């Protein structure tokens, strides 16, 4: 249709206004004295929340240009939460800060490209300074402490996570489920997890987590792309009876076929969910087989001349539970016989021997690790269905936090790590004055999180920021107790990874917007 | 319906405004310091791009006259990218420049026709001057260098392309595909390529490339025009089962029949794609047969009395992969027996002997070259499905760039070739003063690309243009390093063919607009 095209300054102010609505709405929740945001609902009572992510999801502006601005930072900010399980709100306020000043510099006539180079240089410097500040979290003692802090001081959760990582390694698969009632349970079962999310939402039957959860599902492994959902009918009808859900793992499920699956499972007849087969090329055909052996299923490939129409329930794999993400699939408790599974592991281990390459070797180790490693299942304690669901949530978060802390350590939270790191880059310079301004723009922005947290407390940002900058190390301002001291000792910290991702992702979208000269959108008509 | 008719000056200003929106939106992306353009989407997050072609595609104006302006240059500019795989943006800014000044001259009372003759004369001169400036790219060493530069300094890609051209000649068919995993692969298989595109989009299942891609497809060769899609049913049903895609190569597939194919393949039942048979007249019937022999299929012609209803899967040809373009079809790895294919080649080679003409001889050689030459298949390396798809893209582009460089060489990029070529035509004159103005209009426009690139860098066009013009040869301004020197040595170049096509296509639409006196469009009512 006819488009409305805006340029330079007009385009920029629109974007600025858009992110201001977004950031302003979200940042009120930041910190221990964060404020409530009321989100309306089509039917029922409004939602009262302090969850920056929830607020962000609801933001959509009437002005198309302003909206594009909001959707952009809204998008990369979420990339942060995906990468470290936290930091979107931080990323969002950081983006507003960089963009606001960056745009001012532009209107003052400074070079957008040099401004961006400066911001980027400052960010790189900052991330290194961040690694330096970082404290390791490698032993179970630390793993437990972090988990406890994440679970809101629940030593139980900390203990659980530490035991779970001790069982499958700190890089092993760990899932959480509702318990059988009072008292937690930790079990390691035959399972696996690969990087492939659902082939479309709608499959999502747990919107709170935006995940797909199937119980006692059959698993169809098809080494091909599915176009005509007719091929499926005979098998789907079989799965229809038996009343069990079905997970389709194919090379791909195309539009119409996928549509059919969504519609039909939504009508109650047959519960299905599909995801692409892991990897590509030859390591794909191999992995597809691993899953088969693990779940006691039979891969259906056209090469050998097999047909889907002739596939019976007996060809299908089986597991007690599968969980699908926006980009992850994890199979829990596969039926596959230990004899076959363990034997399969043996075959892959010889492959590693006959391996005439390091790459080919690393890929084979990855496979056995999955097949041999299993999956740690944490079953959250209980005493009332309500408390049980609430604890399960804290555990899930504590888990993501601990996982990140194990990967890159921790740093002083409450936004002091960022302000501390910036205080050290006071002499960082670029190739020209514009680049220097860019550097100052970024360093100044790194104070946004702390300042906002302080503002929410009803205190004076300038003063607290001034004091925190005056000291060093992990000396900061505890917004909760409203007292200064060592942030780590006071147990107020963030995984170095979450702070890093928040900053890099913010700096990214900010850099893009500052270097935007034209915007195109449909006419409001 | 009732039309709105505009004349002379009114019509002209409308067109000018239209192309100004187009060019202004697109040119911000030009050069290494190009800016981002944000393109909105009906659902999701906006698209942030520096791809002038993507921006151009989204441009549609509300004012019908202004829109016609944009659509016209938008159209011929795209012809450039089609001819050399690059240059649309350049062509677009070149068109804005010629049109802007050209229209000024018109309003000043100068003769439109003479102005156009002058522009054209200057362009012809410039293209010759461009050939002179051109550096050959005939040996594999050069072929590799160019490909490496195109692949963004990836010697691997350069090497691959050079090896591929060494296998099938620099005028031979070369295709790229996803690899089997890590490490590239180069293979020559039985294949062919002719000048016939898809009989309609929709068939396109790879919008990124605007191409149709079928895997392990059957191939129906019918020496007739298809009207009643009923004739097909028996065969389509056969192809329906077997679950394989079908390529229809007929004299033509008419509206309704074509409509049916699109609809049904879009519903998952049977994947089809159709294209016209290559060539015309008698050399058509022959070529149709070559494809048959190459793919092991049987041509179905009415002359011999064959019917489509009685055609079985066994009559259909077969190949591992076919790729259809906006105007090209390439068959990869045909099943045809080497005995039959090689024997067929023999028959054509005797034809060349018994040839009592040079034309008839050239045509026969073309056929054997196709049938005997085969097709070089580059399978892009890997290590993660993402990197693999990204490298495959760089290879595909590097390929187009190298192909063009092999045809007409290379010249100093960064827009300096054009400004250099113009600096030499300072004495070019026409038959009258209007024509002289036309010449100066074109020569002045040839500076648009460089000037725009410099402006995006935040520098002063007048000065850089002034300096580049002051020197000679391939002495230019490296916008990346923002330093002067030899453009070729610094590895900043464009295939002579892309610069030539951009200029000629720009000059074409500009000449047409300058000589437009009346515009007719539907009433906004």
């Amino acid at each position: 249709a006819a488009k409305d095209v805006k340029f330079g300054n007009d385009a920029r102010v629109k974007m600025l206004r858009g992110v201001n609505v977004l950031a302003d709405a979200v940042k009120v929740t930041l910190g221990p004295k964060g404020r409530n945001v009321v989100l309306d609902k089509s039917f029922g009572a409004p939602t009262i929340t302090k969850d920056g992510v929830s607020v962000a999801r609801e933001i959509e502006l009437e002005d198309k240009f302003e909206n594009m601005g909001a959707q952009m930072v809204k998008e990369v900010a979420s990339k942060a939460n995906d990468a470290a399980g936290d930091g979107t709100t931080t990323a969002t306020v950081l983006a507003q800060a960089i963009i606001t000043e960056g745009l001012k510099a532009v209107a003052a006539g400074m070079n957008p490209m040099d401004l961006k180079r400066g911001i980027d240089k400052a960010v790189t410097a900052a991330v290194e300074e961040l690694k330096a500040l970082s404290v390791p979290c490698s032993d179970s003692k630390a793993i437990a402490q972090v988990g406890t802090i994440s679970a809101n001081s629940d030593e139980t959760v900390g203990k659980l996570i530490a035991e779970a990582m001790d069982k499958v390694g700190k890089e092993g698969v760990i899932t959480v489920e509702d318990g059988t009632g009072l008292q937690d349970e930790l079990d390691v079962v035959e399972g696996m997890q690969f990087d492939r999310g659902y082939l479309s939402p709608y499959f999502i039957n747990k919107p709170e987590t935006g995940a797909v959860e199937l119980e006692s599902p059959f698993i169809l492994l098809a080494d091909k792309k599915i176009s005509n959902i007719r091929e499926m009918l005979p098998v789907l009808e079989a799965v229809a009876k038996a009343g069990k859900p079905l997970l389709i793992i194919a090379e791909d499920v195309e539009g119409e076929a996928l549509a059919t699956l969504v519609v039909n499972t939504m009508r109650g007849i047959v519960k299905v969910a599909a995801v692409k087969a892991p990897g590509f090329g030859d390591r794909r055909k191999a992995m597809l087989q691993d899953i088969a052996t693990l779940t006691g299923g039979t891969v259906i490939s056209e090469e050998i001349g097999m047909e889907l129409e002739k596939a019976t329930l007996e060809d299908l794999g089986q597991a007690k539970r599968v969980v699908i993400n926006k980009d992850t699939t994890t199979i829990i408790d596969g039926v596959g016989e230990e004899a076959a599974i363990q034997g399969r592991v043996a075959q892959i281990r010889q492959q590693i021997e006959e391996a005439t390459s390091d790459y080919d070797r690393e890929k084979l180790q990855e496979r056995v690790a999955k097949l041999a490693g299993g999956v740690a299942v944490i079953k959250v304690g209980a005493a009332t269905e309500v408390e049980m669901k609430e604890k399960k949530a804290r555990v899930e978060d504590a888990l993501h936090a601990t996982r990140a802390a194990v990967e890159e350590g921790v740093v002083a939270g409450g936004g002091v790590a960022l302000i501390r790191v910036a205080s050290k880059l006071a002499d960082l310079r670029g190739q020209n004055e514009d680049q220097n301004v860019g550097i100052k723009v970024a360093l100044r922005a790194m104070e946004a999180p702390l300042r906002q947290i302080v503002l929410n407390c009803g205190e004076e940002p300038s003063v607290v920021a001034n004091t925190v900058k005056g000291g060093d190390g992990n000396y900061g301002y505890n917004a909760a107790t409203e007292e200064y001291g060592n942030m780590i000792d006071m147990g107020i910290l963030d995984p170095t990874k979450v702070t890093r991702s928040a900053l890099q992702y913010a700096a990214s979208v900010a850099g893009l917007m500052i270097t935007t000269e034209c915007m195109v959108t449909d006419l409001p008509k | 319906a009732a039309k709105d008719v505009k004349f002379g000056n009114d019509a002209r200003v409308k067109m000018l405004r239209g192309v100004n929106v187009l060019a202004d939106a697109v040119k911000v992306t030009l050069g290494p310091k190009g800016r981002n353009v944000v393109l909105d989407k009906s659902f999701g997050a906006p698209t942030i791009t520096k791809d002038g072609v993507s921006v151009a595609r989204e441009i549609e104006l509300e004012d019908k006259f202004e829109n016609m302006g944009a659509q016209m240059v938008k159209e011929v500019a795209s012809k450039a990218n089609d001819a050399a795989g690059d240059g649309t943006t350049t062509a677009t800014v070149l068109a804005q420049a010629i049109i802007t000044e050209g229209l000024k001259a018109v309003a000043a009372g100068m003769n439109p026709m003479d102005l156009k003759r002058g522009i054209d004369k200057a362009v012809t001169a410039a293209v010759e001057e461009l050939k002179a400036l051109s550096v050959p790219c005939s040996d594999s060493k050069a072929i590799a260098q160019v490909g490496t530069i195109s692949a963004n300094s990836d010697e691997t890609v350069g090497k691959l392309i050079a090896e591929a051209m060494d296998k099938v000649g620099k005028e031979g068919v070369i295709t790229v595909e996803d690899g089997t995993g890590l490490q590239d692969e180069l293979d020559v298989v039985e294949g062919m390529q002719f000048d016939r595109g898809y009989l309609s989009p929709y068939f396109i299942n790879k919008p990124e490339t605007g191409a149709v891609e079928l895997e392990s497809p059957f191939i129906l060769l019918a020496d007739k025009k298809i009207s009643n899609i009923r004739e097909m049913l028996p065969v389509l049903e056969a192809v329906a089962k077997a679950g394989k895609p079908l390529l229809i190569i007929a004299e033509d597939v008419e509206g309704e029949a074509l409509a049916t194919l699109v609809v049904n393949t879009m519903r998952g039942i049977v994947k089809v794609a159709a294209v016209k048979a290559p060539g015309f007249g008698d050399r058509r019937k022959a070529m149709l047969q070559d494809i048959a022999t190459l793919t092991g299929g049987t041509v179905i012609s009415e002359e011999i009395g064959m019917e489509l209803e009685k055609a079985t899967l066994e009559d259909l040809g077969q190949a591992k992969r076919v790729v259809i373009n906006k105007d090209t079809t390439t068959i990869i790895d045909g099943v045809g027996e080497e005995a039959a294919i090689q024997g067929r080649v023999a028959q054509i080679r005797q034809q060349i002997e018994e040839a009592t003409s040079d034309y008839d001889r050239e045509k026969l050689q073309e056929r054997v070259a196709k049938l005997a030459g085969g097709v070089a298949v580059i399978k892009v390396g890997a290590a993660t499905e993402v990197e693999m798809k990204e490298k495959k893209a760089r290879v595909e582009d590097a390929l187009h760039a190298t192909r063009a460089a092999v045809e007409e060489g290379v010249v100093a990029g960064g827009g300096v070739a054009l400004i250099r070529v113009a600096s030499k035509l300072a004495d070019l004159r026409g038959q009258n003063e209007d024509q002289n103005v036309g010449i100066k209009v074109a020569l002045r426009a040839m500076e648009a690309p460089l000037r725009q690139i410099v402006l995006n860098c935040g520098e002063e066009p007048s000065v850089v243009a002034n300096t580049v013009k002051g020197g000679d040869g391939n002495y230019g301004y490296n916008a990346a390093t923002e330093e002067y020197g030899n453009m070729i040595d610094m590895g900043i170049l464009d295939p002579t063919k892309v610069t030539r096509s951009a200029l000629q296509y720009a000059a074409s639409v500009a000449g047409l607009m300058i000589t437009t006196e009346c515009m007719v469009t539907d009433l906004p009512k």
Partner: peptide, 12 residues
Amino acid sequence: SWMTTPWGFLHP
């Protein structure tokens, strides 16, 4: 446009 199997599956 679509059809329904005896068991209720809606499909093209």
